[PDB]
Amino acid sequence: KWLRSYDFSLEVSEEDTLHLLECVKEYNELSKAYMDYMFKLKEDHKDDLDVCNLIERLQNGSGKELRALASCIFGGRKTSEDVFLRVKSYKKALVLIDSGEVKTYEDLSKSLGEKTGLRGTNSLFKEPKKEGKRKDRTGPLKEDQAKKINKMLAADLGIVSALNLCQKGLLPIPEFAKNVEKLNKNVLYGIISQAGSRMKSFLKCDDLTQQNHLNLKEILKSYRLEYNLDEFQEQEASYQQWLSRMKSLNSFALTHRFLQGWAKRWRKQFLAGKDPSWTLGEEATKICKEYQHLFVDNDFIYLFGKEDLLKLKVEERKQNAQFTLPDVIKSPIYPQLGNNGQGFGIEQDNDIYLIIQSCFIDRPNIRAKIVPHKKTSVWSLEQENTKQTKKKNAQIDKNKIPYKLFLRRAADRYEKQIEISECRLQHRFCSGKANFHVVFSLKGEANDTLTKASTLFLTATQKPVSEWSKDNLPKQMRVAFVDIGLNPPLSMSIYDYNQEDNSGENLVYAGADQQVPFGSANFVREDQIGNVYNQNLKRRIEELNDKIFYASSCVSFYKNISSLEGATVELVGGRKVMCRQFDEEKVKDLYSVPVKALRELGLDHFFGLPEDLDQQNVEAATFYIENHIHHNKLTRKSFLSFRCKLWDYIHEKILPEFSVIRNGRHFQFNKQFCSEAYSWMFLIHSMIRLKKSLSYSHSEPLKKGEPATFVFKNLQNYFNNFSKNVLKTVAAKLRDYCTTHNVSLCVVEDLEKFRTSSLNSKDKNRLLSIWSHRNVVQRFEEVLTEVGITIVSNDARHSSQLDPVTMDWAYRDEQDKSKLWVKRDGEIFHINADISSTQVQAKRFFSRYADIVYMKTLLKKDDNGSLRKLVVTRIQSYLLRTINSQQEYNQIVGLKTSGVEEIYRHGESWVNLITHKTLQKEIGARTNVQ
RNA sequence: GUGCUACAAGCGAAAAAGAUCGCUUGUGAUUUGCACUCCCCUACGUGCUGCUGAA
DNA sequence: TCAGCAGCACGTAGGGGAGAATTGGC
DNA sequence: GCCAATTCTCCCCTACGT
């Protein structure tokens, strides 16, 4: 049910390593040959209704069928009789039972009779499962047997189709039959299994992509048919003329952003009687004004520009999935040793040795030592491995396939038992020398009833909770609600649910709106397992970060004001350097010159901006720069000095600091989780960006798919590994916290629609690129399913904007993110932010969203100019609970909707966004009074 | 075992490079303590990043 | 404060995978 | 005796917003 991986290096001799390289190359060659032959059969042949059946069985079958057909893909089948009897008997069984004259197992067993293939041990006879149960039978037929006899026959008929292909003279792959003499058959089965898995994945992907292109065609047809663009020939002609006139200019494009902005710009500012021209252009604004006279009262552009977007999107999308064959060094295939593939064994005096069977014939088995891990408390096998006088040497045997390895290191919390039945061989070519690792997976069966039983807390309070979940919840279960903000890495709260007690502070109902008072919940305690550690490290990191951003902005300004294409290499300061020209018909349309960057770098003197300036005024700055160009020569020498000084700054004030703090061994996470790991994660990305600027600058762009000049390996690998380490450490902290406080359920927030718990930066460059919410949730699932604690995700919109107790809209102050200002008795107090988010999520959970404070109502207008303000399952349940709410509703729905807005609740009133922000400002302004 | 976790000089890509990658020699390292589901294949989305143009 | 055109990480969703027991010629 | 070849696939019950 859950498999966790572990990688162990191997130490082998040079002869052994050459043997394994030969084996791996053979695997790759054979796998590529198999997939390529299958592709050739797919393309060249699509007739006879036989090859298509085999491709269908490979596409929609299990590994068991791959093993069944392997005996035909290579060589042949010794016996080809029992399958025909099996398909005949199963066809007759399907014809029977469908008659309905029998309703028992015994009648069917006599109906088949004897010599019906089916060599015992199958579901339709005696259903032995694994025990056999002394030939027990259920009695009457169920539905699942009649359902699955069909897939059983599908498998048998696929094997028959492969038999027919072989008998025709097309199935035995010439390469496989050529190699079969010199290679063991176990290897052939393993290669067939792995290559078939890869090809099945590819075939499903290709099917999905073709269906996607068909769906795109269908949706474009629906769009072009619903809007009747063919009927409006004149409107289409006018729209096409407008598009051509726009495309005449060199600064026009058609995009979803343009269409989204058109509705806000032209449909709104046109009523003011003046042209907005918000970065719209000079000729473009005049053309738009001239053409809009035909459709002043409507919006033809919004409804006409989407067709061209659909056409170009349909053109651009790929048709058939791109096909990659396996390569030993590019697209690796990794042998999966086992009883159905390459043989393997494990033997123990005090070192554990792995014996791998050779690919070829008449070659010895290979012996490796499983080199242990960094600090191994216990490390042992289970079989008796006492030394003797070479009873069997290195023997690979079945009857011992599930090897039992006990291992426990320092970081583990419990002795780990791994039942090896397959082991993966992996090859790495680091430093030009091949090395081998064996990968072992440990398996576990995790109980799967807590998720379903927790689903009863997510019902809408309009229908009774699912009965099968009402009787499976633990009686005295303890829940935890977690928030995963950035600066405080983790913040949780713990609640105690008592089925028996019905008088706790939180009450939960498991029926209609207020019915069946099923239990009650209490609050225990809330914690946060992050701290700032030392403030010096955080201060240094922040200073380096804004220094980096200042330097990057300065280099952007330097590039923008320059020209290039006439760059000169001149020996200045003992270095050849390379600077770009300055005379390029300088224009007065520059952006905000990085005045703060020019302050901090010390480069203002070169450009001669006085102290008298601000951070937004550019016309005065432009005039001052022009006057400096006039009065001062500001020749290429000044630009040369400016560039040299900025390069000197970036190489003597940034890189030494970054190195010295990187090599300082701060993020070792010993006895304390440092909150500065996240700031470091950001700064590594910033460093990558800066070094990219230092690398690709002053270069011609890449052309016609030429290979990339640079790779940026060290820094990228550093960033990735740092992110993985910090995620793992946070997950381990959460797991230990839950397990040390007797928690059975963890509740997380789904925030893809709106993110509030993370940073509130307007720019998206600093979010969803360094820290992934989805990976945090995935790691939590992975590390908690191991111990037996389940996590469930719930909606957390406006989590940190609500009062934990009164459910009022509290104020998130802009100065600090760690204080929420709340009134309860006419006075305002500050409460912890993320802790309060956990509290409100808990309140929403235990009451299964009894009260809502956010709805999206749509404005409805008719030909009479009236308004209706119609609202849009938990929401409908809420209405059904408070206002208790048809034909008039469909009548309003049929009316045209002017637009979509939202309504916010503040007690007994439902307000708009403007007045809601006004009320939040009202509740938050009293902070400065006190 | 990996990863928290590499610094300077040579030379070659190479015509500019203080960036990136590859080699050869230096130099502290040696874990001082934490954690560790790991392989491929798609499609399409983001930003990154140079060159150029626009209000 | 975006536009176009080459490379390029990683997301973000998907798609495969970490097999056991029987049975004739030996 | 015995290893290549060849048949094997269930047992459940669960939500909700984009």
mmCIF file with all atom_site columns, N, CA and C in Angstrom, chain A residues 413 480-494 525-533 669-678 726-741 776 780 783-784 832 834-835 838:
data_model
loop_
_atom_site.group_PDB
_atom_site.id
_atom_site.type_symbol
_atom_site.label_atom_id
_atom_site.label_alt_id
_atom_site.label_comp_id
_atom_site.label_asym_id
_atom_site.label_entity_id
_atom_site.label_seq_id
_atom_site.pdbx_PDB_ins_code
_atom_site.Cartn_x
_atom_site.Cartn_y
_atom_site.Cartn_z
_atom_site.occupancy
_atom_site.B_iso_or_equiv
_atom_site.pdbx_formal_charge
_atom_site.auth_seq_id
_atom_site.auth_comp_id
_atom_site.auth_asym_id
_atom_site.auth_atom_id
_atom_site.pdbx_PDB_model_num
ATOM 1   N N  . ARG A 1 413 ? 13.420 6.288  13.808 1.00 0.00 ? 413 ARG A N  1
ATOM 2   C CA . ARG A 1 413 ? 12.703 6.227  15.070 1.00 0.00 ? 413 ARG A CA 1
ATOM 3   C C  . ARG A 1 413 ? 12.240 4.822  15.426 1.00 0.00 ? 413 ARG A C  1
ATOM 4   N N  . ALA A 1 480 ? -5.398 17.680 14.854 1.00 0.00 ? 480 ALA A N  1
ATOM 5   C CA . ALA A 1 480 ? -4.470 18.797 14.792 1.00 0.00 ? 480 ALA A CA 1
ATOM 6   C C  . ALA A 1 480 ? -4.698 19.552 13.497 1.00 0.00 ? 480 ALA A C  1
ATOM 7   N N  . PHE A 1 481 ? -4.651 20.874 13.583 1.00 0.00 ? 481 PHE A N  1
ATOM 8   C CA . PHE A 1 481 ? -4.828 21.753 12.439 1.00 0.00 ? 481 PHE A CA 1
ATOM 9   C C  . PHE A 1 481 ? -3.530 22.508 12.229 1.00 0.00 ? 481 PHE A C  1
ATOM 10  N N  . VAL A 1 482 ? -3.002 22.463 11.004 1.00 0.00 ? 482 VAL A N  1
ATOM 11  C CA . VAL A 1 482 ? -1.654 22.943 10.732 1.00 0.00 ? 482 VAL A CA 1
ATOM 12  C C  . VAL A 1 482 ? -1.694 24.049 9.687  1.00 0.00 ? 482 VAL A C  1
ATOM 13  N N  . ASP A 1 483 ? -0.830 25.045 9.873  1.00 0.00 ? 483 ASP A N  1
ATOM 14  C CA . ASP A 1 483 ? -0.630 26.140 8.941  1.00 0.00 ? 483 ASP A CA 1
ATOM 15  C C  . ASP A 1 483 ? 0.854  26.228 8.621  1.00 0.00 ? 483 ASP A C  1
ATOM 16  N N  . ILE A 1 484 ? 1.161  26.501 7.353  1.00 0.00 ? 484 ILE A N  1
ATOM 17  C CA . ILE A 1 484 ? 2.495  26.282 6.808  1.00 0.00 ? 484 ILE A CA 1
ATOM 18  C C  . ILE A 1 484 ? 3.096  27.576 6.283  1.00 0.00 ? 484 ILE A C  1
ATOM 19  N N  . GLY A 1 485 ? 2.832  28.686 6.968  1.00 0.00 ? 485 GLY A N  1
ATOM 20  C CA . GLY A 1 485 ? 3.421  29.967 6.620  1.00 0.00 ? 485 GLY A CA 1
ATOM 21  C C  . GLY A 1 485 ? 4.934  29.962 6.487  1.00 0.00 ? 485 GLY A C  1
ATOM 22  N N  . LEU A 1 486 ? 5.492  31.036 5.927  1.00 0.00 ? 486 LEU A N  1
ATOM 23  C CA . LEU A 1 486 ? 6.908  31.039 5.571  1.00 0.00 ? 486 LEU A CA 1
ATOM 24  C C  . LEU A 1 486 ? 7.800  31.340 6.769  1.00 0.00 ? 486 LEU A C  1
ATOM 25  N N  . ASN A 1 487 ? 7.690  32.544 7.333  1.00 0.00 ? 487 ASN A N  1
ATOM 26  C CA . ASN A 1 487 ? 8.595  32.922 8.417  1.00 0.00 ? 487 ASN A CA 1
ATOM 27  C C  . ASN A 1 487 ? 8.424  32.039 9.645  1.00 0.00 ? 487 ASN A C  1
ATOM 28  N N  . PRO A 1 488 ? 7.225  31.819 10.180 1.00 0.00 ? 488 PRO A N  1
ATOM 29  C CA . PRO A 1 488 ? 7.030  30.687 11.075 1.00 0.00 ? 488 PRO A CA 1
ATOM 30  C C  . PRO A 1 488 ? 6.747  29.437 10.266 1.00 0.00 ? 488 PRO A C  1
ATOM 31  N N  . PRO A 1 489 ? 7.696  28.502 10.199 1.00 0.00 ? 489 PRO A N  1
ATOM 32  C CA . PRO A 1 489 ? 7.551  27.384 9.251  1.00 0.00 ? 489 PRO A CA 1
ATOM 33  C C  . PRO A 1 489 ? 6.324  26.529 9.493  1.00 0.00 ? 489 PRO A C  1
ATOM 34  N N  . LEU A 1 490 ? 5.917  26.358 10.745 1.00 0.00 ? 490 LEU A N  1
ATOM 35  C CA . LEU A 1 490 ? 4.792  25.500 11.079 1.00 0.00 ? 490 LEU A CA 1
ATOM 36  C C  . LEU A 1 490 ? 4.081  26.056 12.297 1.00 0.00 ? 490 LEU A C  1
ATOM 37  N N  . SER A 1 491 ? 2.751  26.011 12.280 1.00 0.00 ? 491 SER A N  1
ATOM 38  C CA . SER A 1 491 ? 1.947  26.428 13.421 1.00 0.00 ? 491 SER A CA 1
ATOM 39  C C  . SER A 1 491 ? 0.742  25.511 13.526 1.00 0.00 ? 491 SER A C  1
ATOM 40  N N  . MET A 1 492 ? 0.610  24.799 14.641 1.00 0.00 ? 492 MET A N  1
ATOM 41  C CA . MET A 1 492 ? -0.476 23.842 14.769 1.00 0.00 ? 492 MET A CA 1
ATOM 42  C C  . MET A 1 492 ? -1.253 24.083 16.051 1.00 0.00 ? 492 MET A C  1
ATOM 43  N N  . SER A 1 493 ? -2.479 23.573 16.059 1.00 0.00 ? 493 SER A N  1
ATOM 44  C CA . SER A 1 493 ? -3.326 23.564 17.241 1.00 0.00 ? 493 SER A CA 1
ATOM 45  C C  . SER A 1 493 ? -3.954 22.187 17.360 1.00 0.00 ? 493 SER A C  1
ATOM 46  N N  . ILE A 1 494 ? -4.238 21.767 18.588 1.00 0.00 ? 494 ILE A N  1
ATOM 47  C CA . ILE A 1 494 ? -4.705 20.413 18.850 1.00 0.00 ? 494 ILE A CA 1
ATOM 48  C C  . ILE A 1 494 ? -6.043 20.490 19.569 1.00 0.00 ? 494 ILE A C  1
ATOM 49  N N  . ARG A 1 525 ? -4.279 22.547 23.260 1.00 0.00 ? 525 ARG A N  1
ATOM 50  C CA . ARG A 1 525 ? -3.155 23.477 23.252 1.00 0.00 ? 525 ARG A CA 1
ATOM 51  C C  . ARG A 1 525 ? -2.654 23.645 21.824 1.00 0.00 ? 525 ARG A C  1
ATOM 52  N N  . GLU A 1 526 ? -2.024 24.788 21.564 1.00 0.00 ? 526 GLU A N  1
ATOM 53  C CA . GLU A 1 526 ? -1.488 25.115 20.254 1.00 0.00 ? 526 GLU A CA 1
ATOM 54  C C  . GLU A 1 526 ? -0.028 25.525 20.387 1.00 0.00 ? 526 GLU A C  1
ATOM 55  N N  . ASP A 1 527 ? 0.781  25.132 19.408 1.00 0.00 ? 527 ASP A N  1
ATOM 56  C CA . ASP A 1 527 ? 2.215  25.383 19.414 1.00 0.00 ? 527 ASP A CA 1
ATOM 57  C C  . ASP A 1 527 ? 2.679  25.857 18.042 1.00 0.00 ? 527 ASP A C  1
ATOM 58  N N  . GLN A 1 528 ? 3.951  26.241 17.995 1.00 0.00 ? 528 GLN A N  1
ATOM 59  C CA . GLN A 1 528 ? 4.626  26.651 16.769 1.00 0.00 ? 528 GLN A CA 1
ATOM 60  C C  . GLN A 1 528 ? 6.078  26.217 16.892 1.00 0.00 ? 528 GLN A C  1
ATOM 61  N N  . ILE A 1 529 ? 6.569  25.448 15.923 1.00 0.00 ? 529 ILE A N  1
ATOM 62  C CA . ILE A 1 529 ? 7.860  24.789 16.080 1.00 0.00 ? 529 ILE A CA 1
ATOM 63  C C  . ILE A 1 529 ? 8.934  25.476 15.248 1.00 0.00 ? 529 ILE A C  1
ATOM 64  N N  . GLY A 1 530 ? 8.778  26.775 15.021 1.00 0.00 ? 530 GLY A N  1
ATOM 65  C CA . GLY A 1 530 ? 9.794  27.570 14.363 1.00 0.00 ? 530 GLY A CA 1
ATOM 66  C C  . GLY A 1 530 ? 10.184 28.769 15.204 1.00 0.00 ? 530 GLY A C  1
ATOM 67  N N  . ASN A 1 531 ? 11.442 29.179 15.073 1.00 0.00 ? 531 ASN A N  1
ATOM 68  C CA . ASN A 1 531 ? 11.941 30.377 15.729 1.00 0.00 ? 531 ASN A CA 1
ATOM 69  C C  . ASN A 1 531 ? 13.025 30.995 14.860 1.00 0.00 ? 531 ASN A C  1
ATOM 70  N N  . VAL A 1 532 ? 13.276 32.287 15.086 1.00 0.00 ? 532 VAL A N  1
ATOM 71  C CA . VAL A 1 532 ? 14.233 33.025 14.272 1.00 0.00 ? 532 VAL A CA 1
ATOM 72  C C  . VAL A 1 532 ? 15.675 32.670 14.600 1.00 0.00 ? 532 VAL A C  1
ATOM 73  N N  . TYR A 1 533 ? 15.896 31.830 15.611 1.00 0.00 ? 533 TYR A N  1
ATOM 74  C CA . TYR A 1 533 ? 17.233 31.458 16.060 1.00 0.00 ? 533 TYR A CA 1
ATOM 75  C C  . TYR A 1 533 ? 18.049 32.694 16.415 1.00 0.00 ? 533 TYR A C  1
ATOM 76  N N  . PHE A 1 669 ? 20.794 22.409 11.149 1.00 0.00 ? 669 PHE A N  1
ATOM 77  C CA . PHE A 1 669 ? 19.540 21.966 11.762 1.00 0.00 ? 669 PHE A CA 1
ATOM 78  C C  . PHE A 1 669 ? 19.782 20.992 12.912 1.00 0.00 ? 669 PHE A C  1
ATOM 79  N N  . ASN A 1 670 ? 20.753 21.318 13.757 1.00 0.00 ? 670 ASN A N  1
ATOM 80  C CA . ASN A 1 670 ? 21.029 20.540 14.958 1.00 0.00 ? 670 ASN A CA 1
ATOM 81  C C  . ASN A 1 670 ? 20.218 21.126 16.104 1.00 0.00 ? 670 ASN A C  1
ATOM 82  N N  . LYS A 1 671 ? 19.419 20.282 16.753 1.00 0.00 ? 671 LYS A N  1
ATOM 83  C CA . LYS A 1 671 ? 18.663 20.703 17.943 1.00 0.00 ? 671 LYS A CA 1
ATOM 84  C C  . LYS A 1 671 ? 17.772 21.936 17.817 1.00 0.00 ? 671 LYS A C  1
ATOM 85  N N  . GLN A 1 672 ? 17.620 22.471 16.614 1.00 0.00 ? 672 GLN A N  1
ATOM 86  C CA . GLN A 1 672 ? 16.827 23.686 16.466 1.00 0.00 ? 672 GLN A CA 1
ATOM 87  C C  . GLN A 1 672 ? 16.615 23.923 14.974 1.00 0.00 ? 672 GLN A C  1
ATOM 88  N N  . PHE A 1 673 ? 15.379 24.150 14.536 1.00 0.00 ? 673 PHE A N  1
ATOM 89  C CA . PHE A 1 673 ? 15.138 24.418 13.122 1.00 0.00 ? 673 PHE A CA 1
ATOM 90  C C  . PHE A 1 673 ? 15.211 25.909 12.829 1.00 0.00 ? 673 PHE A C  1
ATOM 91  N N  . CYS A 1 674 ? 16.178 26.300 12.010 1.00 0.00 ? 674 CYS A N  1
ATOM 92  C CA . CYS A 1 674 ? 16.415 27.706 11.723 1.00 0.00 ? 674 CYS A CA 1
ATOM 93  C C  . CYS A 1 674 ? 15.382 28.210 10.726 1.00 0.00 ? 674 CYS A C  1
ATOM 94  N N  . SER A 1 675 ? 14.730 29.321 11.066 1.00 0.00 ? 675 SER A N  1
ATOM 95  C CA . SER A 1 675 ? 13.756 29.930 10.173 1.00 0.00 ? 675 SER A CA 1
ATOM 96  C C  . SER A 1 675 ? 14.396 30.647 8.996  1.00 0.00 ? 675 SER A C  1
ATOM 97  N N  . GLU A 1 676 ? 15.709 30.845 9.015  1.00 0.00 ? 676 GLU A N  1
ATOM 98  C CA . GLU A 1 676 ? 16.398 31.531 7.936  1.00 0.00 ? 676 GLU A CA 1
ATOM 99  C C  . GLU A 1 676 ? 16.667 30.627 6.743  1.00 0.00 ? 676 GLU A C  1
ATOM 100 N N  . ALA A 1 677 ? 16.317 29.343 6.837  1.00 0.00 ? 677 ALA A N  1
ATOM 101 C CA . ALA A 1 677 ? 16.462 28.456 5.692  1.00 0.00 ? 677 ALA A CA 1
ATOM 102 C C  . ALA A 1 677 ? 15.654 28.957 4.503  1.00 0.00 ? 677 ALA A C  1
ATOM 103 N N  . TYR A 1 678 ? 14.472 29.517 4.754  1.00 0.00 ? 678 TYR A N  1
ATOM 104 C CA . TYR A 1 678 ? 13.638 30.006 3.660  1.00 0.00 ? 678 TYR A CA 1
ATOM 105 C C  . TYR A 1 678 ? 14.244 31.243 2.998  1.00 0.00 ? 678 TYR A C  1
ATOM 106 N N  . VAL A 1 726 ? 15.303 21.179 3.432  1.00 0.00 ? 726 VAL A N  1
ATOM 107 C CA . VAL A 1 726 ? 14.479 21.956 4.356  1.00 0.00 ? 726 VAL A CA 1
ATOM 108 C C  . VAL A 1 726 ? 13.061 21.404 4.402  1.00 0.00 ? 726 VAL A C  1
ATOM 109 N N  . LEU A 1 727 ? 12.526 20.983 3.253  1.00 0.00 ? 727 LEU A N  1
ATOM 110 C CA . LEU A 1 727 ? 11.205 20.366 3.252  1.00 0.00 ? 727 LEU A CA 1
ATOM 111 C C  . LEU A 1 727 ? 11.196 19.100 4.096  1.00 0.00 ? 727 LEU A C  1
ATOM 112 N N  . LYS A 1 728 ? 12.224 18.263 3.944  1.00 0.00 ? 728 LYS A N  1
ATOM 113 C CA . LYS A 1 728 ? 12.288 17.033 4.719  1.00 0.00 ? 728 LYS A CA 1
ATOM 114 C C  . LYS A 1 728 ? 12.380 17.322 6.209  1.00 0.00 ? 728 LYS A C  1
ATOM 115 N N  . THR A 1 729 ? 13.176 18.320 6.595  1.00 0.00 ? 729 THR A N  1
ATOM 116 C CA . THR A 1 729 ? 13.329 18.615 8.016  1.00 0.00 ? 729 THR A CA 1
ATOM 117 C C  . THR A 1 729 ? 12.032 19.145 8.613  1.00 0.00 ? 729 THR A C  1
ATOM 118 N N  . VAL A 1 730 ? 11.318 20.004 7.881  1.00 0.00 ? 730 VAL A N  1
ATOM 119 C CA . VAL A 1 730 ? 10.029 20.481 8.377  1.00 0.00 ? 730 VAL A CA 1
ATOM 120 C C  . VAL A 1 730 ? 9.051  19.320 8.518  1.00 0.00 ? 730 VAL A C  1
ATOM 121 N N  . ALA A 1 731 ? 9.048  18.406 7.543  1.00 0.00 ? 731 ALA A N  1
ATOM 122 C CA . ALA A 1 731 ? 8.160  17.251 7.622  1.00 0.00 ? 731 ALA A CA 1
ATOM 123 C C  . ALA A 1 731 ? 8.491  16.371 8.821  1.00 0.00 ? 731 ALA A C  1
ATOM 124 N N  . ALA A 1 732 ? 9.779  16.164 9.090  1.00 0.00 ? 732 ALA A N  1
ATOM 125 C CA . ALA A 1 732 ? 10.173 15.362 10.243 1.00 0.00 ? 732 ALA A CA 1
ATOM 126 C C  . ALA A 1 732 ? 9.759  16.034 11.543 1.00 0.00 ? 732 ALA A C  1
ATOM 127 N N  . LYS A 1 733 ? 9.892  17.358 11.616 1.00 0.00 ? 733 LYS A N  1
ATOM 128 C CA . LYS A 1 733 ? 9.447  18.074 12.807 1.00 0.00 ? 733 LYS A CA 1
ATOM 129 C C  . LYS A 1 733 ? 7.949  17.897 13.019 1.00 0.00 ? 733 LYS A C  1
ATOM 130 N N  . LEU A 1 734 ? 7.164  18.037 11.951 1.00 0.00 ? 734 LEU A N  1
ATOM 131 C CA . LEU A 1 734 ? 5.720  17.867 12.081 1.00 0.00 ? 734 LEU A CA 1
ATOM 132 C C  . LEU A 1 734 ? 5.367  16.450 12.505 1.00 0.00 ? 734 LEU A C  1
ATOM 133 N N  . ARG A 1 735 ? 6.046  15.456 11.929 1.00 0.00 ? 735 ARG A N  1
ATOM 134 C CA . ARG A 1 735 ? 5.762  14.070 12.272 1.00 0.00 ? 735 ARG A CA 1
ATOM 135 C C  . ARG A 1 735 ? 6.082  13.783 13.729 1.00 0.00 ? 735 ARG A C  1
ATOM 136 N N  . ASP A 1 736 ? 7.232  14.250 14.198 1.00 0.00 ? 736 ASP A N  1
ATOM 137 C CA . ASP A 1 736 ? 7.580  14.008 15.586 1.00 0.00 ? 736 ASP A CA 1
ATOM 138 C C  . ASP A 1 736 ? 6.584  14.721 16.504 1.00 0.00 ? 736 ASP A C  1
ATOM 139 N N  . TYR A 1 737 ? 6.196  15.942 16.147 1.00 0.00 ? 737 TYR A N  1
ATOM 140 C CA . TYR A 1 737 ? 5.226  16.666 16.961 1.00 0.00 ? 737 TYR A CA 1
ATOM 141 C C  . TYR A 1 737 ? 3.913  15.907 17.062 1.00 0.00 ? 737 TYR A C  1
ATOM 142 N N  . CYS A 1 738 ? 3.405  15.416 15.931 1.00 0.00 ? 738 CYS A N  1
ATOM 143 C CA . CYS A 1 738 ? 2.147  14.678 15.959 1.00 0.00 ? 738 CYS A CA 1
ATOM 144 C C  . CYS A 1 738 ? 2.278  13.391 16.762 1.00 0.00 ? 738 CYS A C  1
ATOM 145 N N  . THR A 1 739 ? 3.392  12.675 16.602 1.00 0.00 ? 739 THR A N  1
ATOM 146 C CA . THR A 1 739 ? 3.553  11.388 17.269 1.00 0.00 ? 739 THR A CA 1
ATOM 147 C C  . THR A 1 739 ? 3.888  11.527 18.746 1.00 0.00 ? 739 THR A C  1
ATOM 148 N N  . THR A 1 740 ? 4.467  12.650 19.158 1.00 0.00 ? 740 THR A N  1
ATOM 149 C CA . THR A 1 740 ? 4.764  12.893 20.561 1.00 0.00 ? 740 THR A CA 1
ATOM 150 C C  . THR A 1 740 ? 3.593  13.497 21.314 1.00 0.00 ? 740 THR A C  1
ATOM 151 N N  . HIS A 1 741 ? 2.486  13.778 20.628 1.00 0.00 ? 741 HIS A N  1
ATOM 152 C CA . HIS A 1 741 ? 1.324  14.386 21.259 1.00 0.00 ? 741 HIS A CA 1
ATOM 153 C C  . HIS A 1 741 ? 0.054  13.591 20.979 1.00 0.00 ? 741 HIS A C  1
ATOM 154 N N  . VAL A 1 776 ? 4.860  20.348 -0.130 1.00 0.00 ? 776 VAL A N  1
ATOM 155 C CA . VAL A 1 776 ? 4.730  20.294 1.322  1.00 0.00 ? 776 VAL A CA 1
ATOM 156 C C  . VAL A 1 776 ? 3.633  19.313 1.713  1.00 0.00 ? 776 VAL A C  1
ATOM 157 N N  . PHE A 1 780 ? 4.046  15.710 3.644  1.00 0.00 ? 780 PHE A N  1
ATOM 158 C CA . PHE A 1 780 ? 3.304  15.427 4.868  1.00 0.00 ? 780 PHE A CA 1
ATOM 159 C C  . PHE A 1 780 ? 2.570  14.098 4.757  1.00 0.00 ? 780 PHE A C  1
ATOM 160 N N  . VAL A 1 783 ? 5.245  11.202 4.962  1.00 0.00 ? 783 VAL A N  1
ATOM 161 C CA . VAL A 1 783 ? 5.861  10.945 6.259  1.00 0.00 ? 783 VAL A CA 1
ATOM 162 C C  . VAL A 1 783 ? 4.845  10.615 7.338  1.00 0.00 ? 783 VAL A C  1
ATOM 163 N N  . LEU A 1 784 ? 3.564  10.905 7.126  1.00 0.00 ? 784 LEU A N  1
ATOM 164 C CA . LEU A 1 784 ? 2.570  10.580 8.136  1.00 0.00 ? 784 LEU A CA 1
ATOM 165 C C  . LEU A 1 784 ? 1.851  9.269  7.872  1.00 0.00 ? 784 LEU A C  1
ATOM 166 N N  . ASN A 1 832 ? -2.224 36.016 17.916 1.00 0.00 ? 832 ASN A N  1
ATOM 167 C CA . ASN A 1 832 ? -1.307 35.417 16.958 1.00 0.00 ? 832 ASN A CA 1
ATOM 168 C C  . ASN A 1 832 ? -2.035 35.086 15.661 1.00 0.00 ? 832 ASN A C  1
ATOM 169 N N  . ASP A 1 834 ? -1.157 33.061 12.628 1.00 0.00 ? 834 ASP A N  1
ATOM 170 C CA . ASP A 1 834 ? -1.284 31.695 12.128 1.00 0.00 ? 834 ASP A CA 1
ATOM 171 C C  . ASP A 1 834 ? -1.995 30.788 13.126 1.00 0.00 ? 834 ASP A C  1
ATOM 172 N N  . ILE A 1 835 ? -1.755 30.993 14.422 1.00 0.00 ? 835 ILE A N  1
ATOM 173 C CA . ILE A 1 835 ? -2.500 30.260 15.439 1.00 0.00 ? 835 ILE A CA 1
ATOM 174 C C  . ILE A 1 835 ? -3.992 30.504 15.264 1.00 0.00 ? 835 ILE A C  1
ATOM 175 N N  . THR A 1 838 ? -5.410 28.577 12.407 1.00 0.00 ? 838 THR A N  1
ATOM 176 C CA . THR A 1 838 ? -5.726 27.212 12.815 1.00 0.00 ? 838 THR A CA 1
ATOM 177 C C  . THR A 1 838 ? -7.032 27.161 13.596 1.00 0.00 ? 838 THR A C  1
#
